[PDB]
Ligand binder design. Structure first.
Ligand SMILES: OC[C@H]1O[C@@H](O[C@H]2[C@H](O)[C@@H](O)[C@H](O)O[C@@H]2CO)[C@H](F)[C@@H](O)[C@H]1O
Ligand SMILES: OC[C@H]1O[C@@H](O[C@H]2[C@H](O)[C@@H](O)[C@H](O)O[C@@H]2CO)[C@H](F)[C@@H](O)[C@H]1O
Ligand SMILES: [Mg+2]
Ligand SMILES: [Mg+2]
Ligand SMILES: [Mg+2]
Ligand SMILES: [Mg+2]
Ligand code: NA
Ligand code: NA
Ligand code: NA
Ligand code: NA
Lengths: 1021, 204, 203
């Protein structure tokens, strides 16, 4: 009766910040309750641990109040069978929502909306009775979003809040032998929601594991590990504190053993009872052991050396009651003199922020995925990750511990949508709620070596609640520093200056919470902390421009110790078309309102875990080896702090315009932070004209746990020389033949023919034989299909006048009208010469002026010359080039320039100058939300079909016009056009990326010169 | 002004104070006081309570106040009288010249305490000169020290009035009662009597 | 029904450190709500402020569970008339205890003892309706030791812990014009007790 919904729901615990849990047990590190040492030791699987994951019964309701009492007793008829864990929105029950800042619900804390989607989960299962006899049996919910009530065998059990941490309950008193039934009522909204405003998809359900744990009545209730070292790390002290629950008896003992794989390194045994702590005594129920270790093996992202620790609770006679264990890593994290140190050295964080997201599973995680991520990261030179913005699936930590990644554990608190942001955080009333959120995380994760920094959450302003919490940790766990960006990134609540989106050299002086250039920030009067950006280089779409600027600063300023890119994967979901075709969806794609469109897409990889081109730039900028070239010597520098170049091969090679003339292989031998000199054999001195370039690569001969054999970890290239061509084109036996008409001019030469329309002034068509070559005339082009960055947050409804796109639009760039100023033809002794002049205008203003010359000789080549003038008072144009639609369509693309991936002016350091050949398809970048893409710069020769272009330009080539791209919102809606679209740019604006909601392209990358010149050569084979 | 928190009987004393679980409870206790009394000029120091050992909960609370009300210092004696949780060294019952070196929470002579390596805070005894019955011997010793050492800024005597209650004899005669006088068990007898004045407010 | 003891006491909020209050308003400095400057200025007395101190009706029980639902509705027969504020031990209801360090009860947080002396206080009073028309009306307990539940006109209102600070509740929705009745159930032990071990008389 009191177990009745009617009654339980009476209280509406989900609308009371004062109630965050009911009868939930206390937090702690991971238990298995092994009943055998070896097992625990070898991390086998414990039988006192049982998963309840699988098929369950589900039913959905628009509101809690609509639930039926029967439910408690009996399963429903209309119930469905579902797999757990999972997100109900992923099963079509309701929609997933995608907002960033704005709360999905109405802001009226601590009130949630009357219509609050309820998910009734139920499960019937059997229990061994042996369990029922002795010991304790509890259930564990690794993750339930957002809040929920629980019943067992018809009996009300408890309540819980905080979608990201475990919830435990003692079932011991509700279990019957044999068949039992669980009834979990889960709710979308709760007061907890107010603390969970992360910019992610808003979902719900039992998205994390469910289990049962059988523990002895007298058991290990908790334990902590700590390492201490001597000044040189030649000796450590493992110190373990253990707490027990149960019946205290003098024959109880505890043994802690340290293992190095097969070897037992140290052991210690003792009886309960601590040292005096105060006037009343000590902890009778605790005990602390101290193990000494000589020449311990240190743990690091570079070399995750691990040890295993075993905690055995037993009697004096030797009888074991139970065992617990964990992996241990010897490392010391400390901030000293402005620097963040690890094991004595100063780190350089090559980090990234990462959400728990699966295109198919929603927020549900699994080993497989996790590992994928890890491997990728490692493979791309990352060494750290930030749990944006809640505690992760437990397994994660282990993996990181094992694989080697620095981690920032972050509390599940974001109140982004409040106003002002710290409205809650500065309120005592919410303190307790917040507290729970921090404390619990700590208790759970504190023994993992990979965790090196605690974080109080994200975007929640700065409030006293923070200060208090910050302090709490400090007292409880002094082994790791604490950071928090809210309220200015340098408050009393952070041990590190951890801004987000601060620029390298430019200040953004917002009131109250200005973002200084990072170099300046460091030097403010009185400032002494290290600086690490919690978020930077917004990777939304075609982005990452400027990345190198950061890396360079990082490398030059000691106190700038890196940052975490934003972010790992796109938060895109799959949908299907009627043909059962899957496609990537984003904000509003589920009729979800309100929503933030593509904003959920900012990763370096696609949800499927396929890389965006940007990834490469990252990998390159983050390499662990740095090169210097001096004469014939290569200087190599190691950015490793702990390892030696023991799996490194250096391949080098020389080529002339793509023609390889020499290669070499040299094994690396460099100590962490050391230098290696590399002597080059005498280099070739070709006569032929061209550019001589040197290229080095670093290879990993042997595979690793995270990499294959032959992995490339670093590269670098240099231009050795140049041999200017002083040659002359041999004579032609003939010369083109001009032919006027009213409409045009005709140039003929053999099978070749070119035509220029006299009204438009453009080269309208050209033939080879009887084959027309263009579907569209060759013309000047000044715009681009806006990048995400070009758009920012401008919306049709709510336009952002400073967005590039906005300006371009307003300027009429997108719709200016060309006007022939002049067009003439002339016959020279050795060729035909055409000259034109056009003007683009808009509303009486002249934006650009394009003056060209086309000169066709007897060799059949057409040389083009372009000179443009840009009004100083118009917004710098996205680009300056030409375009046309070629009638032909080929398989491959071959060029001599920067490659092979997409590269832009402010994003091309990772690219190499060579000869590339790819399939047309590869020249396209399937950004979910479409825009200008696939460009390659620094090109000297381009070949497609019978065509060849020469000069010095950048280009792109695909089947989609810029207009198409510009007019389509999803990749899945593009359809190839008739021939091949080609854009050849003399110049192209940068892409930016410092952030995606303001103009982020640096001046050096803007087309602000006023006058531009370029030349080109076109021919056929 | 002192928060309503004493866990004296725990064991060890900070059993609760060092537990997150009790944090919220404790919090309420502090926060609320502050919100209520902060505008009174007479209040010049906030105190986190009494005899509850020293626990993280304390640190957090200490900090909270500091942030919210920077106008007054915060003190707390628990756990040694000189923890990170107090702006002042505020022991109770430390002697003028003699040290009482209890393990973990020794009570140094107050003159010595001041000079410990690294110590810089002022010292004010939160409790001293136990006025139980025929007492107060030695009082002058303190006063003199106080007067001679700048950093010794005084203290609060323990305590004002006797905590005695009235009872009646059969002749309807009233009489002062103490521990166990109500059959109350267990009890601490006269210990409730340590004032400078009698409950009626008549001076000792 | 949900206002029923049977139901309310179900939860045993007094044995849960997680629950320290229910529907209690937020803390703040002292208000009078003067409606005239001068008054406030000269610290006169505000009429938006009313004392409920005086004679009330009291009844004592060895345990909460022993209370009678009737109580909610109707005053008791065996109820006594008492002055408030006051300490029930001072009226002979039970004994005052004098321990210093040692807890008066058994140490088993957050558990309190089954026999936990309950004091049922009740009060019937009249409310001007003008108050009932506009504005907000709340009640204020300057001090209740140690924990307690509250009802107004038969309706369950809230809960509170911490014997030394005020507890406030908005009555606005439970008041009727004219006659109203308050029912306050007060408890000796509560989880709060674990935080109130001062060496003083336990009342
Ligand atoms: O990828 C989204 C990021 O948004 C930033 O917040 C911006 C927000 O995008 C913008 O709409 C608003 O005008 O300004 C905010 C600046 O605080 C976040 F800060 C990032 O962490 C991402 O969520
Ligand atoms: O007036 C009583 C005072 O007792 C002190 O505590 C003593 C206690 O009296 C004694 O029985 C025990 O052995 O040692 C305690 C020392 O911590 C208090 F500290 C004072 O504040 C008074 O309560
Ligand atoms: Mg709640
Ligand atoms: Mg956000
Ligand atoms: Mg309680
Ligand atoms: Mg005491
Ligand atoms: Na640096
Ligand atoms: Na985003
Ligand atoms: Na002095
Ligand atoms: Na006393």
């Amino acid at each position: 009766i009191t177990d009745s919904l009617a009654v339980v729901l009476q209280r509406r615990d989900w609308e009371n910040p004062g109630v965050t849990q009911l009868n939930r047990l206390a937090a702690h590190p991971p238990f298995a309750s092994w009943r055998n040492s070896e097992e625990a030791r070898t991390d086998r699987p414990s039988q006192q641990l049982r998963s309840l994951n699988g098929e369950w019964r589900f039913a959905w309701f628009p509101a809690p109040e609509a639930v039926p009492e029967s439910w408690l007793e009996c399963d429903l008829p209309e119930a469905d069978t579902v797999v757990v864990p999972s997100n109900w929105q992923m099963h079509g029950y309701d929609a997933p929502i995608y907002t960033n800042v704005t709360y999905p619900i109405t802001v009226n804390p601590p009130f949630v909306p009357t219509e609050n989607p309820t998910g009734c989960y139920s499960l019937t299962f059997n229990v061994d009775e042996s369990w029922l006899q002795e010991g304790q049996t509890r259930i564990i919910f690794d993750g339930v979003n957002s809040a929920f009530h629980l019943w067992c065998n018809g009996r009300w059990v408890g309540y819980g809040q905080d979608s990201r941490l475990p919830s435990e309950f003692d079932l011991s008193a509700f279990l019957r032998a044999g068949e039992n039934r669980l009834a979990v009522m889960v709710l979308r909204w709760s007061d907890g929601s107010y603390l969970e405003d992360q910019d992610m998809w808003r979902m719900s359900g039992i998205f994390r594991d469910v289990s049962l744990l059988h523990k002895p009545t007298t058991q290990i209730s908790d334990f902590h590990v700590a390492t201490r070292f001597n000044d040189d790390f030649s000796r450590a002290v493992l110190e373990a504190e253990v707490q027990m629950c149960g019946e205290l008896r003098d024959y109880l003992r505890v043994t802690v053993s340290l293992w190095q794989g097969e070897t037992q390194v140290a052991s210690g045994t003792a009886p309960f009872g601590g040292e005096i702590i105060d006037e009343r005594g000590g902890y009778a129920d605790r005990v602390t052991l101290r193990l000494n270790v000589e020449n311990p093996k240190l743990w690091s992202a570079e070399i995750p050396n691990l040890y295993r620790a075993v905690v055995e609770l037993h009697t004096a006679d030797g009888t074991l009651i139970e065992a617990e264990a964990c992996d241990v890593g010897f490392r010391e994290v400390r901030i000293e003199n402005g620097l963040l140190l690890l094991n004595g050295k100063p780190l350089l964080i090559r980090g990234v922020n990462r959400h728990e997201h699966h295109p198919l599973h929603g927020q549900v995680m699994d080993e497989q995925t996790m590992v994928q991520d890890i491997l990728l990261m490692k493979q791309n030179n990352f060494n750290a990750v930030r749990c944006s913005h809640y505690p992760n699936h437990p397994l994660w930590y282990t993996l990181c511990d094992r694989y080697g990644l620095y981690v920032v554990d972050e509390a599940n608190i974001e109140t982004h949508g409040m106003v002002p942001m710290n409205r809650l955080t500065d309120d005592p009333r919410w303190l307790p709620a917040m507290s729970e959120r921090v404390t619990r995380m700590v208790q759970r994760d504190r023994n993992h070596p990979s965790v090196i920094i605690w974080s109080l959450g994200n975007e929640s302003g700065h409030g006293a609640n923070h200060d208090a919490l910050y302090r709490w940790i400090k007292s409880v766990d002094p082994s790791r520093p604490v950071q928090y960006e809210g309220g200015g990134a340098d408050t009393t609540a952070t041990d590190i200056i951890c801004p987000m989106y601060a620029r390298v050299d430019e200040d953004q002086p917002f009131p109250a919470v200005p973002k200084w250039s990072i170099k300046k920030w460091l030097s403010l009067p009185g400032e002494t902390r290290p600086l690490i950006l919690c978020e930077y280089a917004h990777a939304m779409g075609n982005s990452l421009g400027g990345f190198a600027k950061y890396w360079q600063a990082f490398r030059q300023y000691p106190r700038l110790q890196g940052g975490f890119v934003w972010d790992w994967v796109d938060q895109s979901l799959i949908k299907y078309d009627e043909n059962g075709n899957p496609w990537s969806a984003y904000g509003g794609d589920f009729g979800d309102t309100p929503n933030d469109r593509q904003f959920c897409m900012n990763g370096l990889v696609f949800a499927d875990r396929t890389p965006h081109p940007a990834l490469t730039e990252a990998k390159h900028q983050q390499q662990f080896f740095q090169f210097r070239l001096s004469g014939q010597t290569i200087e190599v520098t190691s950015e490793y702090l702990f390892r030696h170049s023991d799996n490194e091969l250096l391949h080098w090679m020389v080529a002339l315009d793509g023609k390889p003339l020499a290669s070499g292989e040299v094994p690396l031998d460099v100590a962490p932070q050391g230098k290696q000199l590399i002597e080059l054999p005498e280099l070739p001195q070709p006569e032929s004209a061209g550019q001589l370039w040197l290229t080095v690569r670093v290879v990993q001969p042997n595979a690793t746990a995270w990499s294959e054999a032959g992995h490339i970890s670093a590269w670098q290239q240099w231009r050795l020389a140049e041999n200017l061509s002083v040659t002359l084109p041999a004579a032609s036996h003939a010369i083109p033949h001009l032919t006027t008409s009213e409409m045009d001019f005709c140039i003929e030469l053999g099978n070749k023919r070119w035509q220029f329309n006299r009204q438009s002034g453009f080269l309208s068509q050209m033939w080879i034989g009887d084959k027309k070559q263009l579907l569209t005339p060759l013309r000047d082009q000044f715009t681009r299909a806006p990048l995400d960055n070009d758009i920012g947050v401008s919306e049709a409804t709510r336009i952002d006048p400073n967005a590039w796109v906005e300006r371009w639009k307003a300027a009429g760039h997108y719709q200016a009208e060309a006007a022939l100023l002049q067009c003439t033809a002339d016959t020279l002794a050795d060729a035909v010469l055409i000259t034109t002049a056009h003007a683009w205008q808009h509303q009486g203003k002249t934006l650009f002026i394009s003056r060209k010359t086309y000169r066709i000789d007897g060799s059949g080549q057409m040389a083009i010359t372009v000179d443009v003038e840009v009004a100083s008072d118009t917004p710098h144009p996205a680009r300056i080039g030409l375009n046309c639609q070629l009638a032909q369509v080929a398989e491959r693309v071959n060029w001599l320039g920067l490659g092979p991936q997409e590269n832009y002016p402010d994003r091309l350091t990772a690219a190499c100058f060579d000869r590339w050949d790819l399939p047309l398809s590869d020249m396209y970048t399937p950004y979910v939300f479409p825009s200008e893409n696939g460009l390659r710069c620094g090109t000297r020769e381009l070949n497609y079909g019978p065509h060849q272009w020469r000069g010095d330009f950048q280009f792109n080539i695909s089947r989609y016009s810029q207009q198409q791209l510009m007019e389509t919102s999803h990749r899945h809606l593009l359809h190839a056009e008739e021939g091949t679209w080609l854009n050849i740019d003399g110049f192209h604006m940068g892409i930016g990326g410092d952030d995606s909601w303001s103009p982020s392209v640096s001046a050096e990358f803007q087309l602000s010169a006023g006058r531009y010149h370029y030349q080109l050569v076109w021919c056929q084979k």
